[PDB]
Write an enzyme that holds these catalytic residues in place. Structure first.
Site, PDB file in Angstrom:
ATOM      1  N   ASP A  69     -24.480  57.044 -11.244  1.00 11.18           N
ATOM      2  CA  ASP A  69     -24.460  56.227 -12.460  1.00 11.18           C
ATOM      3  C   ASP A  69     -25.832  55.641 -12.721  1.00 11.18           C
ATOM      4  OD1 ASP A  69     -23.632  54.434 -10.106  1.00 11.18           O
ATOM      5  OD2 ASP A  69     -23.590  52.913 -11.620  1.00 11.18           O
ATOM      6  N   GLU A 134     -22.384  52.191  -8.560  1.00 12.69           N
ATOM      7  CA  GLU A 134     -23.145  51.264  -7.730  1.00 12.69           C
ATOM      8  C   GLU A 134     -23.772  50.175  -8.612  1.00 12.69           C
ATOM      9  OE1 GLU A 134     -26.677  51.135  -7.825  1.00 12.69           O
ATOM     10  OE2 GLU A 134     -26.789  49.588  -6.275  1.00 12.69           O
TER      11      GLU A 134
HETATM   12 ZN   LIG Z   1     -30.332  50.410 -10.106  1.00  9.26          ZN
HETATM   13 ZN   LIG Z   2     -29.854  52.726  -7.420  1.00  9.60          ZN
END
Ligand SMILES: [Zn+2]
Ligand SMILES: [Zn+2]
Ligand SMILES: [Zn+2]
Ligand SMILES: [Zn+2]
EC number: 3.5.1.18
Lengths: 370, 369
Positions: A69, A134
């Site tokens: 992501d 994340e």
């Molecule tokens: Zn980042």
């Molecule tokens: Zn990262």
């Protein structure tokens, strides 16, 4: 192996994977690894995709960890190359995700492939742990994958998280740990001559002096001492006498103390001052630390013998998923490209550096297993 | 004069003057006082309607003080006579504000009028000081009137606050003292371990919250401090996060003064080398009316009218007495039974309303001649 890496990085960058949406990134990685003998295990949760891809069935288990992501782009007309086109201009690859972290994800994947290809009966297990979240909420990503591995007692011995760790020159920093973070949400009830000493705000003040002076540990070689901060103190609406006093405090703690020890000591101080209270705890992360040893020499020596620089090992660097992975008893280090352009307009990374990262990740495997 | 008092009290009770909304109460009072020789001066502020009316020019100034607002009724299901209907039943006037304090407001009003009609050339000044917010926030009521009077150096020599003072029998109690009110607004700035401003500020807080200002005295309970606000840090939408803000109130007896309070607070801060600013807001001063002209005038008034001797008490219920004592007035309070105040089926004896009217009138006659 440069052009293979750059080629994969461009495929990934061209998929606009704003968290938690993977946009097919993990599936092209899976397809590809599947053809090369990797076992493919999908661990989606809610709106997040996670992937655990393994070659080999035994210890030592070496995982490369990362995320597909990316953060949002801003207005795309501020960009010199369109953010999801993955153009290379004059040896630099431009794109959202180029530095954080699609380039190094590609470097790690290509490192893993060329190793198992050359070494089909390597001992141990080479694995890839990839989440699609994340950067945002990060509840249903790496921690979910970790919790799943743990529920069935599956091991990771060593882990390299390929976050862009370099500060000024490629190879100058490797992260080998991070302080824990825990937050107390404390609510003192009933705050309204004779018996002035029994006022709960007074007892709260006594507790506070003790909490702000208490020495938790003396830190160590790798960490400063555990620090406590009073984040917030709140009673009253700004006019109605308040019934409760709210205190919020955070500890950034090192390996000398645990969270259970902090919680039991804070409880102890509250009882010692005879306070009636309610407390809610929020653990963000436990501390982790990879001491010099096999893992840290393998990456340190890999950097030195590839690009001729001696990296400094450092704790800190802000949030990665390393703190989650370390919960399963894996030793975690982190290394990747320059981080100077991450989350900015015109994010980019050197094609040459991506090549070098590939070679460094591959040499780490050789040093760990050969 | 019982009938004029009862009638006026009813006209006020019917106006649903929930704090701070006067609902035309002060206008109906102004109209009648104006028909006698009274100077009417409105002093509204924000949502509150103040009324300062006087007859005469010379000192002594004798102010009658009270409020037209009432606390909320609660569920109108539980009243055995609707809270604003002002019904008389078996000698009792029923309603929100019968007891607290429209009944006694009416009695003080009729007493002031009757005296003025009968004595056009009276010495001194007879005044009424009426507010439409004593019961709630009480920031823009009596406090505002006193600010205005003090700014132009207008005096009140004596004040009778009509809060219902009686405990068991009409006249059994007069309130002759109240504690003062001061508010501190403190901004501690800048918020190896014992040197952090947070640590030092916690020591200060320890002190502030147990320092024994006094143990009260023969006539008073102890000075109290309470914290209204403590704010620090980024949370809760705090717009001064790098400061530790503490707002605290002292309800203080005569054992200390505003000056001792401020000095002492400043001293405690100094001891910790804290960088700070502090704004103080003195809203009310304590008072204790000792034997003398004022206290004799009402004690004798009650003895004359009903044959009972009031005992003098400090505190109990609430009033704007301390806000008036800020300007140097001598203050006493007297009024009807207080046992139904702020409750369902609040009511008041109409004979007691008559007697109150006589008592307030006799008090004027005793004070003047
Ligand atoms: Zn980042
Ligand atoms: Zn990262
Ligand atoms: Zn009242
Ligand atoms: Zn009241």
């Amino acid at each position: 192996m440069k052009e293979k890496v750059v080629s994969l990085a461009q495929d990934l960058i061209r998929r606009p994977s704003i968290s938690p949406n993977d946009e097919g990134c993990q599936q092209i990685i899976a397809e590809r690894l599947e053809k090369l003998g990797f076992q493919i295990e999908w661990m989606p949760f809610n709106d997040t995709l996670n992937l655990w891809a393994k070659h080999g069935t035994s210890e030592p288990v070496i995982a490369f960890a990362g995320h597909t992501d990316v953060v949002p782009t801003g207005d795309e007309n501020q960009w010199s190359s369109p953010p999801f086109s993955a153009e290379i201009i004059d040896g630099m690859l431009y794109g959202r995700g180029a530095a954080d972290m699609k380039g190094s994800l590609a470097a790690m994947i290509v490192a893993a492939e060329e190793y198992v290809k050359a070494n089909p009966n390597h001992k141990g297990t080479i694995a890839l742990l990839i989440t699609s979240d994340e950067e945002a909420t990060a509840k249903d990503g790496t921690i979910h994958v970790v919790e799943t591995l743990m529920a069935r007692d599956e091991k990771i011995t060593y882990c390299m998280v390929g976050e862009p760790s370099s500060a000024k020159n490629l190879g100058d920093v490797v992260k080998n740990g991070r302080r824990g973070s825990i937050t107390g949400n404390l609510y003192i009830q009933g705050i309204q001559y004779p018996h002035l000493a029994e006022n709960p705000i007074h007892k709260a003040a006594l507790f506070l002096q003790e909490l702000t002076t208490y020495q938790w540990d003396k830190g160590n070689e790798f960490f400063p001492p555990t620090s406590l901060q009073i984040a917030n103190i709140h009673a009253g609406t700004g006019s109605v006498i308040p019934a409760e006093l709210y205190i919020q405090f955070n500890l950034r703690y090192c390996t000398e103390v645990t969270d259970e020890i902090i919680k039991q000591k804070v409880a102890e101080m509250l009882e010692k001052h005879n306070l009636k209270y309610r407390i809610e705890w929020n653990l963000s992360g436990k501390p982790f630390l990879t001491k010099p040893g096999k893992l840290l020499d393998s990456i340190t020596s890999a950097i030195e013998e590839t690009i001729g620089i001696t990296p400094k090992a450092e704790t800190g660097g802000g949030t990665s998923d390393g703190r989650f992975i370390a919960l399963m008893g894996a030793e975690v280090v982190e290394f990747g490209p320059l981080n100077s352009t991450i989350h900015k307009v015109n994010e980019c990374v050197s094609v040459e550096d991506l090549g070098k990262c590939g070679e460094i990740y591959h040499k780490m495997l050789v040093n760990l297993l050969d």
